[PDB]
Structure formats: structure tokens, C-alpha cells
Design a protein around this ligand. Sequence first.
Ligand SMILES: O=c1ccn([C@H]2C[C@H](O)[C@@H](COP(=O)(O)NP(=O)(O)OP(=O)(O)O)O2)c(=O)[nH]1
Ligand SMILES: [Mg+2]
Length: 903
Amino acid sequence: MKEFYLTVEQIGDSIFERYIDSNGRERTREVEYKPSLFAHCPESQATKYFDIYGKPCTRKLFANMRDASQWIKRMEDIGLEALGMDDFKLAYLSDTYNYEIKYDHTKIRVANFDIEVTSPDGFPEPSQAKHPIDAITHYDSIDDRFYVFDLLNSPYGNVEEWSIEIAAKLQEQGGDEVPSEIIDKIIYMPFDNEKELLMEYLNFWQQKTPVILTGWNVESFAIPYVYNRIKNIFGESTAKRLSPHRKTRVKVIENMYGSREIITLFGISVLDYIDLYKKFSFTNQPSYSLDYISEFELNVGKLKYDGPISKLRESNHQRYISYNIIAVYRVLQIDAKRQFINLSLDMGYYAKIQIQSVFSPIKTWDAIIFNSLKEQNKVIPQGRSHPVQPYPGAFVKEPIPNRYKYVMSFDLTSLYPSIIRQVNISPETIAGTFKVAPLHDYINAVAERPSDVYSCSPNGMMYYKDRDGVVPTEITKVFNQRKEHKGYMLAAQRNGEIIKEALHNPNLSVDEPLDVDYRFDFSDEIKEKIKKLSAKSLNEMLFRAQRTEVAGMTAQINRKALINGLAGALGNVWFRYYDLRNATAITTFGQMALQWIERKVNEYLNEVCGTEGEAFVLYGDTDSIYVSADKIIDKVGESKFRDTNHWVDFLDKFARERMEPAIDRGFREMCEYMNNKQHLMFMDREAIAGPPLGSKGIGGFWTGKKRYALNVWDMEGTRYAEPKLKIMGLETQKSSTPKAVQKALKECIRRMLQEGEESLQEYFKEFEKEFRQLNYISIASVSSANNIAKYDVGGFPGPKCPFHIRGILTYNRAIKGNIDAPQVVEGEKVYVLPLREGNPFGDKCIAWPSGTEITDLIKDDVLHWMDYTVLLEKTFIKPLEGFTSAAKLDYEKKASLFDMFAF
DNA sequence: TCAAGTAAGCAGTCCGCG
DNA sequence: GCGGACTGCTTAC
Ligand SMILES: O=c1ccn([C@H]2C[C@H](O)[C@@H](COP(=O)(O)NP(=O)(O)OP(=O)(O)O)O2)c(=O)[nH]1
Ligand SMILES: [Mg+2]
């Protein structure tokens, strides 16, 4: 096999690399790497190295990396550009792995761990590490074993050994219900004291040194706690054994309103799963506790236990350890589903960066572009300092608030990357400028043609057409990967609907799920076999199809995020290729494209309908248009359709055979108008939406920009067994909206779109009557909480104090002096409830840490004083009033009337 | 919330609006 | 009480 790196670091004048050799073995080496950098030189000087603008460069080879860094400094002193890759380890990787890396994940040691620390005086701060570590569970991917380190003797209590027998039993049997599939994979090690525990953990770490290190909050808690605890007990040299190169650094991470410390372990790649999740999941969660996320992702129940965690070890050490084990397994289960580790490895090895650099789109693209240019003996420019400047973005059309019965949407394929490719936007392809007219003039095709030589954007930029720029070339490669995975995702989605249909008529039999590849549309043979399967087998197949879809989603959406990130990086001052000319060339072209095609679609439909000056495009945002299809349906007459699926087929055919060819013609003309390099504006049908045939449903509505709902029957070729609500921006979609309120508002919307006004009125009446019975957590609002201190004046709200912050201050006064009460954490999220006048808390609201039950110290009083009236008005009625007013209907029945008497 | 971008909505404070 | 100037937070894209 070809070799591949595991980790790389620069330590002084040495590169330290861990790698897998040609025989599949892990090895480590220290290389006295001599870096090269470049300076411009005279033409009369024969060279093979040229900068991206074709200017000749001389290569300077340095005796060592320190000399190279010093030369860069002196070049700044002189006032001359120092060209080349200044991050020497990336240059090292480029030289050492000068080929497309094929990695073998089975050879990479991925460690997943979690620790427990009993603390009787509040949250145990990792920077102090003053309490014993009393449990560590460490899963190793190569061994496929959970290694459990259990402290039996501590100043906070001496306990008996954990029992694997009781751990396996059902909770109804008094057990901990540790999943049976991992019971045989646990290796349990009890310790008589903490020094022995930690010395053994370090010896173990030396034998099985993680390459990828993950877990939940490991970067902010577990890692620094272990490091600092060992440092406190044994000293610095021992703690540094956590690094394979015995090198660590305290890293200060700054944010707008403060900073925190982490520990960098040279030679390890830490990928904290909470951060992988936040980056790759495309969720915004009301809480990021492992229990909350596990429930959301896996539908597992939260780990139950009596009393506070600070007393759990002494009261129930059995459960304490079992829950530490389960915590590690939960992260493994989330990854089995989401596959974020796989994704990180793919991206990291593709770019040739430290794996943890996947968190930085700028570092990722810097490396991809550097490797691409290096292959042509080209030399990258030096990064420069730029002042931050705002610049313009996408166009969003103002919709007329209203119901919209039949709607068809269209959207451009990966817009910004396609614009980069079409126009040929790149640092080195800038050809010049042209005198710009008002955007309106280009949209209406009355401005004079920008250029008859170069490819243009309506921001005034021109680009070469003789050769692709490095940005277009490299963005295309990642786009093509994204396209492949999106294909698998959609097939799995379509396959899912096939199974859902079959689940309506399952066979009464005992059988097994079919062995199929869900990434490809089911063949006729498979479909025939599916109709003869039991419900048990069908549901298992559905689960597998959905997991396949999720894997496809992870792979496709995050590759799209990467290429969108390149477009955005052009507008970030820290990017080597930062250039507002290029950033704005993309966004401005996007604004034109959207409004150009709005005009073309309107013109086309006015022609087909024999109307004039009517607006068929009701809305658009960035790269999508929404088209009213009422008139199209009406030309046939709703009476001629057999069922809902019949008119859906009709619209699907109309979009593909009539509208899309017209759309293509429009964009081809725009391409010629801008003299672009390649036509890549590909816009096809996305959604088909409308009410169920014969119903009083309204189909859809808009309240304003970025706020709408549609009853969708077909989404990009996936025909749904049951209609699916597409709701964007509305309160149902916001993590700040109470859980039970999201549910209720969604049902109100469903009834509006599918059933009509009377159905909505019936549901509203019921919810209003019963909502006071809802669990307090399900009706609490949620908010991030920043700058708590700023608004704290003697424990009371200062001027302009935000409502959620006021709630936190109320909470803080209520638990004052209690060292065991949960503390609100600056920057994290809280639940918020309004309080009735005259309450003992002394203010109109209270807030506590999100994802948790409010402390028993005050719970009863909070429950007693909750202001249900205010809660309902703010979170439910106000938003519903917005939906219904926009849709021109009433959630409460109006005077009959027509009572007229009895009945 | 360390880590590519902009557009734009709603809640809430403060306070004018004769 | 509504709504502009402002902050804070959250979406869509
Ligand atoms: O996080 C984002 C999202 C979108 N955008 C821009 C770029 C993107 O091309 C455009 C449209 O975004 P979408 O992801 O909604 N769709 P896109 O057209 O990029 O891909 P596709 O439609 O093929 O899924 O908005 C960003 O810059 N950052
Ligand atoms: Mg698109």
C-alpha cells in the first residue's frame, strides 16, 4: 500500500510525523526539513518557477525552518514580497505525499473517551483540576474495546467494584441496561488509588496512542482536566506524556466577550464531537448536552438517576460507571449515523492538512490551492493585511403576503461555485474592468455588452477566457464529488418512499429484510420482492434506507459547504486570495442571474397564458424562484384530474418539457451577454406544491421575506407517499420557540395548507383550552445568553437589559449562596419562562440552563407562578396571527350569523 | 461562541408621539 | 400602543 500521514507537527527546526508505512504499520520520524521560499527575480535569470501572474521567481532553499521564518521577517523589514508556503508542515506534506492520498481508516487509531470527576463545591474547573478523576472510559477503534479505569478509593468515598453482570440487566431488573452488543467489549480495571489509575492510563496511552481523539466536550473539559490533574499530582514532564512528542502548549481561545484555555497536544489530532456536530449537522439545538443530542439523533432515553451527579458515585457507583461507559458509546452511535469522522478524514487527506484543520475553510482551501499550483511549478503569493470592509450579497424579492394555492419552484445548481466556474473568477484570471451600468440595466438587457473579449460580471470585472483559473479548476473537483454523493442521497430518499408505500399493505409472514444497496434506485425485481415482505422486515429496510440517506446527506451537504466556503473566503481578510473584486463579482452576478430569469419566466408564462404584464414569479431568494401555477392548473380545470397525483404529474411534465427548456434559453442568452467562458447556470424544478385535490386546504402562504410554508408533493423527483410540509423561517423552525409550541404551530400550518380554515379553527380552540397542562420545559422559550455580567448591577438588571438576561439575574438571586446549584454558563443557552405579577422571585421572568430540569430548590415556586397567559400570547398567538393574516383567514370563527336560533 | 460570506426576520428596551 | 433606533438572537441562503 502507498504510505499516508497520520499527524504532522513543526517543533523548532524539525518536522515530527506519525505515519502509516508501505506495510501498513504505524511509525514515527523526525525530519530536518529544509523549506523553500521564493523572491521575484529578473527575466534575464533562467527559472522554472513563476508566480500566479507569470512573473519569474528564484527559489531560496533554507538551512532550516527558523532561517526561513527569519527571512520572511526581514523581507517585511525591507518591504518586499516573500512568496511561497509559509506554513512549513503543509509544504512538508506536499513534498512527502506528492500524489492523491488513499488512506485506510482501519489503520488509524481513533480514540473516544469520557471522564468523571466528583465535586462537592460546584463545576470542576479544568484549569484548576483540584478534584480526583474517579472514572475514565476510553474506547479504541483498532481494538474495538472499551477500557474502563475505575477509582475505588477517594477522599469523596470508598466504593466497591463495578459489576458487569448488573450493568447488563434491564433497568426493570435493577440493572443499568448497558447495551448487550458492547458488554463483551468492555475491559474493566479497578484501582485502589488515583495515582495508580493515572500512571496506568498513561502507560496505556503510550501503547495505544490516539491519532484522532474525540468525545463530547473533550477539548474544553476532559483533555485539559486530565492534563492539569496529572500535572498537579506528578508534575509537567509526566503530563506531557499525553503528547507522543512530549510537547504541549496552553492555547488561549479568544471570543468577542472573553477567552478560554485549551491544551494543544502535539502529535494528536483532536476532533471534539460537539464541534464536529455543530459544524456538520446543520442543526441549531436548544441544548448541546450529550443526553439531549443522543435523544434527538438516536431516540434513546436520557440516562436516569436519583440526586445530583456530585453524589452519584457515593450513592450509586454501579450506575455511575455504567453511565460513563454509555456516554462513550453514545458518541460512537451518533458517528455511526452521521459519519462526521469519515468526512473529516476524507476532507483532511484531500487537502493534505492536519486533520483538525477541517474546522478552517481558509486553511483547507489554502492547502488545496497551494498543492494545485505547486504541480505546475507556480508560486503562491504572500498573505497580506486588509481592513475589513462590508460588501453586497444576494438578492431577495419582497413577496406580496398572501396564500398561494399552486406553486412550483426552481433553483440553480450550486450557484456560487457555478458562477465562479462560468465567469472564470480567480485571483490570476483578472483581465481588467469595464464601466458599469445600473444592475437594473443588465437585468433588462439594455446595458451595452460589457466585453467582446473577456468574461464579465455585472460588478465591472473581466476575466480571461483562454484558460481556467486555479479556483475554478479546484472548485469543480469538489463540486463533482458533491454531485456524486447527492445522487446517492436522492436515490436512498426515493427508495425510502417505495418502502413507505409497501408498509400500507404488509405481508402476514416471517421473513428477512432484503440485502440491497440503498444508494441506487430499486430495480423491478427488488420492488416485486418488497411488496411480499412483512412489516418487521419493511421497517428495518426503511431504517436502513434512511441511514443511507443520512450518510449521503453528510457527504453531499458538507462538500457543498466547503465550496460555498471558498466563495466566502474571497471576502475574508485572512485568506491568501482575499479580493473584494472577486467576492463581489460572484454575488453581483448572482443578483443579476436571479432577476434576469425572473423576467424570462414571467415573459414565457405571459406568452403561454395569452396574458400580459402579469407576475408569475411570486418570490425568489438568492438562487431560487417560486412560480404561481394556478393559471396553468385552471387551463385544464381541476375537474379533469383523477386525483392529486394526477395534477402533480401534469405540473411535473409542464416544468420539464416547457419551462426548463425556456429557462435554459434565457440563461444561454445571459451567458453570451456577459461573454462568459462556459454556460453553467442550470436551473431545474425543485418543489411542486398545492392542496389535496378536492380539499379546502390553501396549499401555501408567504408572510414576508424568508418566511413561508408549502404543502409539497414532489421534491426534486422524490414523489411522496404523503405530502410533506416545507416550512422556512417560521417559528416552527426556530430553536428559540418552545418545543410544544413548535408542534402546535406546525399542526396549525398543516391544517391551513391541507384542510382549510374551519379545521384550523377547531384545533386552535383545543390547544388554547389544554395548553396549561403541558410540561413546563416543553413551553419554555430558549435563548443563547451572552454578556450576562454587562447587564448585572448589584444582582439586578441594568439599563437595556435583554429579557433572557433579566431571567438569568432572577435565577442568580434565587440560588444565591448555594454552591451545588447549577450555574448558568456565559455563552450557552437557557430556558426562559415569564412570571406572574407579585411572585416571590421579584421579577417578570426566570431563566435556567437549557436541556435541564430547573433545580428542586425553586422548581415548585417557579411552576406555581408561571405566566401561562403571557406565554401563550407571545409564543403561540402572535406568530399564528401572522400566519393567518398573511393567508387571509381567521383562527377564530367570525359572527355566524346565521345563528340563527337553536339548531 | 476559534474556525468562509451577506440578507433579513422577530423580540425586547427605550422613549417619543401633543 | 405603535413604531423607529438600537441590541440581541435566529434564521435563509
Ligand atoms: O451557508 C451558505 C449557504 C448559501 N450560500 C450561498 C452560496 C450558494 O451557492 C447559494 C445558494 O445556497 P444553497 O446551499 O441553498 N443552494 P446551492 O445552489 O448552493 O446548491 P444546490 O441548490 O445545488 O443544493 O447561497 C452561502 O454562501 N453560504
Ligand atoms: Mg441551488
